[PDB]
Amino acid sequence: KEAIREHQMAKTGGTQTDLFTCGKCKKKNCTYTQVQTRSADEPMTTFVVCNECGNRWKFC
Amino acid sequence: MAGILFEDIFDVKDIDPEGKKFDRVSRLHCESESFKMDLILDVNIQIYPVDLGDKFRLVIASTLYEDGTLDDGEYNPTDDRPSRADQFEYVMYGKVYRIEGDETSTEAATRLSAYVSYGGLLMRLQGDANNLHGFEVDSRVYLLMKKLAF
Amino acid sequence: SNRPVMGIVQDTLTAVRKFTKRDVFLERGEVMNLLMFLSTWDGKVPQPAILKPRPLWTGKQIFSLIIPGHINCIRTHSTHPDDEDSGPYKHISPGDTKVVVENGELIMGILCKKSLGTSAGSLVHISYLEMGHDITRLFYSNIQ
Amino acid sequence: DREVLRVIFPTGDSKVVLPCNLLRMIWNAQKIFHINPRLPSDLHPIKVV
Numbered sequence: 001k002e003a004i005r006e007h008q009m010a011k012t013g014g015t016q017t018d019l020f021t022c023g024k025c026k027k028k029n030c031t032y033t034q035v036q037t038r039s040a041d042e043p044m045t046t047f048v049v050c051n052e053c054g055n056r057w058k059f060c
Numbered sequence: 061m062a063g064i065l066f067e068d069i070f071d072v073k074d075i076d077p078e079g080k081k082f083d084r085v086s087r088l089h090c091e092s093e094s095f096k097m098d099l100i101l102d103v104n105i106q107i108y109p110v111d112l113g114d115k116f117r118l119v120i121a122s123t124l125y126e127d128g129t130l131d132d133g134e135y136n137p138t139d140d141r142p143s144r145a146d147q148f149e150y151v152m153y154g155k156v157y158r159i160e161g162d163e164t165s166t167e168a169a170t171r172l173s174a175y176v177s178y179g180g181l182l183m184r185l186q187g188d189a190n191n192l193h194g195f196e197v198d199s200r201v202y203l204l205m206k207k208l209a210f
Numbered sequence: 211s212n213r214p215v216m217g218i219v220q221d222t223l224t225a226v227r228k229f230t231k232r233d234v235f236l237e238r239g240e241v242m243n244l245l246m247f248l249s250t251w252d253g254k255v256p257q258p259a260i261l262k263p264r265p266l267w268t269g270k271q272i273f274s275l276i277i278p279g280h281i282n283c284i285r286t287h288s289t290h291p292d293d294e295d296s297g298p299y300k301h302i303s304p305g306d307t308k309v310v311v312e313n314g315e316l317i318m319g320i321l322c323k324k325s326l327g328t329s330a331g332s333l334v335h336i337s338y339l340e341m342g343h344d345i346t347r348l349f350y351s352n353i354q
Numbered sequence: 355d356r357e358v359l360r361v362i363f364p365t366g367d368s369k370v371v372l373p374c375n376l377l378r379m380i381w382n383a384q385k386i387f388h389i390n391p392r393l394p395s396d397l398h399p400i401k402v403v
């Protein structure tokens with residue numbers, strides 16, 4: 001009953017960085033993006049998303 | 061006739077703005093000799109080499125040619141009027157950008173704070189009633205200081 | 211995407227960052243030199259930012275000259291500086307890390323692209339709204 | 355409206371793209387009219403209504 005209970009536990013991944021604060025919940029429960037390798041005229045940005053309460057903002 | 065906006069002699073609390081500082085500009089922290097009012101200000105250290113704990117004289121005037129209007133900008137270098145708070149060692153032209161206070165407590169407005177900008181140069185003045193006659197305005201004030209390294 | 215398409219870039223963007231520096235100081239001679247570069251100007255020389263020990267102008271003063279004189283854009287310095295969410299609040303020496311302009315006059319703040327365009331909260335979008343394309347195009351050509 | 359609005363946005367995000375930024379417009383009036391927190395705020399509320 002333990003081992004079959006364990007089979008949900010984590011699921012299959014992870015991430016989280018816990019660096020940027022979220023102004024909607026003070027907790028730094030945030031995720032970060034590495035994208036825009038080249039793109040156009042828009043500068044390559046680091047995008048940060050807060051898992052809880054759904055917040056996303058940019059390095060810029 | 062020379063309706064000065066402010067005048068006081070100030071003491072340097074700090075010349076090191078949070079350590080990191082900057083090259084041609086540095087932020088001083090000062091307190092008035094009443095020791096009831098304090099001040100933080102960005103300055104050109106290169107033209108005015110401050111020392112820590114120094115005793116400074118500070119004056120503020122929203123006008124020069126006495127009390128009459130002049131809030132214009134013909135940097136008329138050729139003025140000859142002795143109505144110049146010029147004898148002070150250091151002069152700046154600027155605006156008040158922010159005012160702090162607290163009137164929600166009932167009349168309070170207790171420990172009024174004024175923030176001022178001279179060409180981007182930030183300033184903070186704190187005081188119960190020293191700023192009771194001033195408020196945030198477009199660029200008009202002239203700030204004059206002397207008594208460097210007294 | 212209800213956003214501006216214009217964008218000042220590269221050399222121009224870098225020198226603007228350089229130009230917003232606190233250590234930027236100008237001479238009267240160069241101010242006249244800078245004034246002639248203007249695509250448009252009131253014909254009225256501005257007051258020195260400094261009078262003593264010697265008369266001087268700041269780059270923020272002069273950038274604000276470029277700016278049209280009755281419109282403002284705030285809240286997005288969008289630079290790494292200062293800190294994320296509560297450090298700059300750490301007293302309010304509002305500082306050079308955050309952008310603020312009033313009555314066409316830049317108070318503080320190193321510039322970014324999110325300020326400069328192709329994004330929400332950009333100066334470019336509001337100038338387009340207030341000043342219109344014609345005034346904004348002449349300002350833009352002038353600044354460049 | 356506040357009670358209705360909870361139905362419309364179950365995500366609870368109040369940040370939406372909309373026309374006419376009244377805040378900037380209202381702010382501009384303040385920049386123009388020169389209203390400040392140390393000046394009285396003479397107003398007729400029904401006129402507002």
Ligand SMILES: [Zn+2]
Pocket residue numbers: 022023024025026027029050051052053054055
């Ligand atoms: Zn959050």
